[PDB]
Amino acid sequence: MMQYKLILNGKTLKGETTTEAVDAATAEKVFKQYANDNGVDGEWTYDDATKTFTVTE
């Protein structure tokens, strides 16, 4: 049950993407760097209940 829709928080920036990783920790470095690559800094948010990762600025 790896997530399939990575939802980025953006006011005028919207999209989704999907990739594979070796494990959750390995995916963390990529996902956080991808938020940084968008000019988004903030705490990482996750809901196991829905299997989604959101960046709370």
From Swiss-Prot:
The chain holds residues 229 to 282 of 448 of the full protein. The gene is spg. Binds to the constant Fc region of IgG with high affinity. Sequence repeats lie at residues 4-57. This is Immunoglobulin G-binding protein G. It is found in: Secreted, Cell wall.
